[PDB]
Amino acid sequence: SDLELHPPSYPWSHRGLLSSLDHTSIRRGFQVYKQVCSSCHSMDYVAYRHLVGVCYTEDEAKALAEEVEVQDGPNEDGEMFMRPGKLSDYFPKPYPNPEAARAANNGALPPDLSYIVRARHGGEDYVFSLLTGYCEPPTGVSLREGLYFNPYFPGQAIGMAPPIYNEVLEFDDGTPATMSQVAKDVCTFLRWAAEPEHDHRKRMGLKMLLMMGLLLPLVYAMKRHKWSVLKSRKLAYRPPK
Amino acid sequence: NNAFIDLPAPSNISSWWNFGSLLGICLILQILTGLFLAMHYTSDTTTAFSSVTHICRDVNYGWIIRYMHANGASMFFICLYMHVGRGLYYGSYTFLETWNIGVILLLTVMATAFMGYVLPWGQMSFWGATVITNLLSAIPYIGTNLVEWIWGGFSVDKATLTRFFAFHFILPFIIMAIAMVHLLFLHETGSNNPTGISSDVDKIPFHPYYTIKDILGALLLILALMLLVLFAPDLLGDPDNYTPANPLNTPPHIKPEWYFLFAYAILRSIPNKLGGVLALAFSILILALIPLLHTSKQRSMMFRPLSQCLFWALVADLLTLTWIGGQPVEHPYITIGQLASVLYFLLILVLMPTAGTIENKLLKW
Amino acid sequence: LMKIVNNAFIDLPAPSNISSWWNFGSLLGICLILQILTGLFLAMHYTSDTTTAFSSVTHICRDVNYGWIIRYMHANGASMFFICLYMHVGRGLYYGSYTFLETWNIGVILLLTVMATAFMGYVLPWGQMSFWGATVITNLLSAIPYIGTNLVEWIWGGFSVDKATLTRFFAFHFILPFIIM
Amino acid sequence: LVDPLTTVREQCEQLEKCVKARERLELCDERVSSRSQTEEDCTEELLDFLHARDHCVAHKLFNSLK
Amino acid sequence: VAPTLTARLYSLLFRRTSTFALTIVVGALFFERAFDQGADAIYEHINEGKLWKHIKHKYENK
Amino acid sequence: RQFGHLTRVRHVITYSLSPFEQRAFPHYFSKGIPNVLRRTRACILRVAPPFVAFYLVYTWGTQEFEKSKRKNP
Amino acid sequence: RHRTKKEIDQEAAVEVSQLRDPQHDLERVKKPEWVILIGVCTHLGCVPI
Amino acid sequence: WLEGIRKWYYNAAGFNKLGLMRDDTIHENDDVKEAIRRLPENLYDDRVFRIKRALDLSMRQQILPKEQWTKYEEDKSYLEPYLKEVIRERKEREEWAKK
Amino acid sequence: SHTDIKVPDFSDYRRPEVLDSTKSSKESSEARKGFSYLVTATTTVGVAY
Ligand code: HEC
Ligand code: HEM
Ligand code: HEM
Ligand code: HEM
Ligand SMILES: C/C=C(C)/C=C/C=C/[C@H](OC)[C@@H](C)[C@@H](OC)[C@@H](C)CCc1oc2c(O)c(OC)cc(OC)c2c(=O)c1C
Ligand SMILES: C/C=C(C)/C=C/C=C/[C@H](OC)[C@@H](C)[C@@H](OC)[C@@H](C)CCc1oc2c(O)c(OC)cc(OC)c2c(=O)c1C
Ligand SMILES: CCCCCCO[C@@H]1O[C@H](CO)[C@@H](O)[C@H](O)[C@H]1O
Ligand SMILES: CCCCCCO[C@@H]1O[C@H](CO)[C@@H](O)[C@H](O)[C@H]1O
Ligand code: FES
Description:
The structure is cut from a larger assembly and holds 9 protein chains of 7 kinds.
Chain B: E1 8-10, H1 19-38, H2 48-58, H3 62-90, H4 96-118, H5 123-133, H6 143-151, H7 158-189, E2 203-205, H8 206-231, H9 261-268, H10 273-285, H11 305-325, H12 333-362
Antiparallel strand pairs in B: 1-2
Chain E: H1 5-14, H2 17-46, H3 52-55
Chain F: E1 12-15, H1 28-67
The structure holds heme C, protoporphyrin IX containing FE (3 copies), stigmatellin A (SMA) (2 copies), hexyl beta-D-glucopyranoside (JZR) (2 copies) and FE2/S2 (inorganic) cluster.
PDB class: oxidoreductase
Keywords: cytochrome BC1, membrane protein, heme protein, rieske iron sulfur protein, cytochrome B, cytochrome C1, complex III, MPP ubiquinone, oxidoreductase, redox enzyme, respiratory chain, stigmatellin
Entry title: Bovine cytochrome bc1 complex with stigmatellin bound
């Protein structure tokens, strides 16, 4: 239907003006993308090297990249070949092209997730609500096969079956993998993926606010100093009588 | 010197007079961030969107230069609209040459920003290129030919993106030359002031009085720009442009950049192709008619109560049209937009000239 | 509008006897306009990515209507530019025009800027000469002690001439002619 | 293994506004359910209910997550 | 007879154009280290336990 | 336009003080606030109404829109 | 587009004289269950939904 | 009474608060400039000072004490006899140019 | 007479250190210039940063 359900505002720890992302949460969120979302969704603009110093050490990221095989070549025989992944490789695509993706998903296309949070009104509030909001169709609503009812998706009929649920994966740090916890971490990871500059712009913004707090009144003082010559000047008209 | 240092200026110009220098700064800012982005941007449809993400993710500080350019374009329009509003309210338009060049400047900046928005080749980029170039199709007999000629084909495609990068690259420098001419005509008369009365009996030197005041203004502009860049870089943007262009699908809630919303509302209010395009063109070109519609014996609106009330009604109306442009073409927005569109032209063509005459009568001249 | 078009052209006083050697100044103005006009039109079809630069140039010469004439007019126009530049400088040396110090020294800057401009344009089609010309000439800076090498890598955007180099050179080549103007 | 989302949803559904909405929802379920033919469905009633419950969930949920 | 503070500053650093520019160069250099260190400390404290530098120890061991 | 050639003025005396002899913020708050209040009051009747109208049209239209999207408006 | 019977019947029932660009549906299709069109809005080029 | 709204308007216009007379506020076109040029010394000098006093108040975003406001009943058109003649002269020339 | 011309009172605008007409203002000049120039130097430092 043409009805709309807008997402509520969750108190993300990175919500505040000077609040950074929770990096342990980014790290768990990456595990979610990796174990769960990557089989249907690509993330074409993130490479293993981007994780270094963000949520994994250089060696951990190196080990992560090696867990997959990527195509390279041509070799001296003019042929392509497979090799372990390395830091410079971008996350593997689950399908060679969108047609193959649609074919593998009853015709629906799992969008690339690198910018999904910036590409949707509501951002992570929307994504979190969608992931944790699947429910039964209301009485009178009957969906075609292949579609699932989700009140937060426009039109409420989505081609993605509920992808997460309790214990869908195990976290490296033992955090209980409840559906809501998993959603919260993947959403934090997706924010970082869409805006890696997130923490740095806020640190810079703090410095900008402090500098402005200093420079604005000083320049204003300079303005008032020069202008005092005019602001206190006195006029007198003395025509001949 | 004498074009700056000892330039005579009115002792009383207010902060509304700071927007000219702020526009100069917005122009320099766009040129500087623009050139640096152009050092990493590639205009092929296969790689345009990619090169932009590459700028934001891997080029050192690429993200800040990019968002400064995007938000800088928004600041440019805020300043442009403030600058034009100051002119209408204070009767600065009586400086005919300066004013008409200003109208050309507004149209060129609009055309320039339009083309830049197409460069990242996201969804809004693509449909904006489609819609806006198609405005020309309203031209009888040859309209469609003009559009295909601009496109370099039968639809927006590679040829389009590549030439748009070139046009967007050079136009700002042309704008800079036109702005210098804008200032030269202004210098022949010197500035107008809040009273609308000649200020020749009380001129002060531009330096140090307005040089320091302009610097204070520049600092406030930078604060506004950086609040957006560092704390809300996407606030004034559209999420749909984070989706690569898809020629087979126009997003269901597609809407123009905020600074084009009022004009879009006006065009959308007319259920006729040529009529909508003519109203759009006229909503901007009518600025060239303001001087001919001036009936008041006084230059500024400072001493004109009735004119002031109608002026703020016009601003409130543009605010209405901006809001309507952001809403779906459904009831009661369709009717509110039609009224607002009619009110816009009615205030400018009839109500304001009439208030001017009434005020003259009340003063007995 | 009249004046300075305007008394700066129409009623400009000129010697009664200047010869053909004085024609090169206006010919240089024409070479500049030619390069700018053919340049903009080529830029409407040229792409600066190393994977597609050379290709976009062949596309201009093979498929864009009259693309070949615009391209060869730009290439040969650069040659005409230099022929005129050298005739112009020669005239100046022979007739002592250099005593107009400001005009002359600005002229020296103009010669250097046109050389730098032509250099960068030649790199754009990304053929063999493009690549090695970019390599050698940028490396002239490596002769600068202490920072030379750093300056080169900064100009290149890397440890060797590559994508970053070609893309910024398109930008530099694009704007420099207007600065020359 | 219990998801705090379950706990919090249960708690939030106790609010007056949520009960009222659930009631209208069940009223629609009964009304639509009893006709062999009807254009109507209870989407609107469901969304109203969810909007009220989720506004409440958003204020509490994250306290239980890491 | 001890002159005020701004008075000493005027005579010692502001009166001569050379000395007035030196003070701004050196001042900016000290201001830079102190401001960045201070602001960085404020930022990291506001976000204690969330930054990579705060959790990093858990994954390294070169 | 150059100083020396602007216009004709006779019998006007102007007295001024060096910026170093005076305060840059004389009665900033004590006199500034009253002046701001005065200026604000003097214009409010001319500036505010149209925006109040916008507000009313805005709230009315938005509500009318929502109401129209449901079963029982 | 593969049209249904109800859709075909709705288009046949249209009062052609009332259209701004008057055409009977059958002047626009060859096999009624199939409508083939260039998906470009005649206004300013977007894609109709 | 029209006249009632007139005094109301005069005060709403507010140039009186800056000590200006209505004619001090006229938009200067060529007719007006010629009329100002024809003013006798005293009217010209007075105009200059009132405008100068007004520009000064405007710069400080201030107004005069109410007792010093130009009074409606005392505002007179010192420029009218001069401007009217300048316009008459131009009209006469324009008529002649058409014959 | 031009001797009837006296400078208006500025006591309401004067910095406190120059309020006494029976004292030399030179005694406070360095302090007054130091204050304003300090505002200028600090500003320039912030801008350099
Ligand atoms: C294949 C079995 C999938 C898995 C595993 C996940 N998703 Fe998915 N997703 C899939 C499809 C086929 C679609 C298209 C849905 C449609 O009807 O258009 C999607 C879509 C999404 C979206 C976009 C929704 C929108 O507003 O357009 C998001 C944000 C999304 N999916 C997220 C997501 C995440 C984070 C996942 C891992 C937990 C995940 N999906 C898994 C198919 C599949
Ligand atoms: C790239 C855009 C523009 C730039 C850089 C620019 C710059 C300037 C500058 C530097 C001033 C002097 C300072 C001031 O009074 O604000 C000025 C004045 C003026 N401009 Fe613009 N301008 C631009 C666009 C326009 C537009 C769009 C209009 C109106 C349609 C316009 C109309 C005027 C007028 C009438 C004046 C005289 C103002 C007065 O003295 O009261 N300008 N402009
Ligand atoms: C009047 C001045 C200018 C305006 C108003 C302007 C505006 C814009 C706008 C609105 C965009 C879209 C931004 C986005 O959302 O990504 C854009 C993109 C861009 N602009 Fe400009 N621009 C100006 C000058 C320039 C100049 C001089 C150059 C380059 C020489 C330039 C280079 C670019 C490039 C390469 C992009 C694409 C990357 C990006 O999208 O950020 N711009 N411009
Ligand atoms: C002082 C003026 C200019 C000079 C001396 C100059 C010189 C050159 C040279 C020597 C080449 C290589 C030609 C070849 O392919 O063999 C070139 C290429 C190019 N120039 Fe220019 N150029 C000028 C102005 C411009 C301008 C203003 C633009 C664009 C706005 C431009 C755009 C290009 C483009 C797109 C190419 C690559 C295509 C091609 O190789 O023909 N040039 N230029
Ligand atoms: C080669 C150069 C060319 C062809 C230049 C053309 C320049 C034309 C005008 O500038 C002078 C034009 C930009 C200006 O009209 C006065 C704007 C106010 C028009 C605003 C405008 O924007 C839209 C927009 O941005 C969109 O984005 C996704 C989508 C849109 O509808 C779906 C519109 C739209 O319906 C209108 C009217
Ligand atoms: C980012 C911009 C940069 C770095 C600009 C630098 C500009 C430098 C100078 O212009 C001012 C420079 C072009 C000018 O020196 C005065 C020329 C006469 C230098 C001529 C020149 O050409 C060569 C060339 O073209 C080649 O092609 C395949 C190959 C070359 O050797 C293998 C050379 C070469 O050995 C020299 C000296
Ligand atoms: C400067 C104050 C601007 C008001 C904030 C709202 O801003 C609006 O938000 C919408 C979605 O939230 C966007 O689609 C729209 O383009 C943007 O202008
Ligand atoms: C925009 C409103 C214009 C109405 C005309 C003003 O009319 C005036 O209003 C004054 C105050 O109410 C009265 O004291 C006065 O007698 C009356 O003529
Ligand atoms: S309604 Fe305008 S392009 Fe379709």
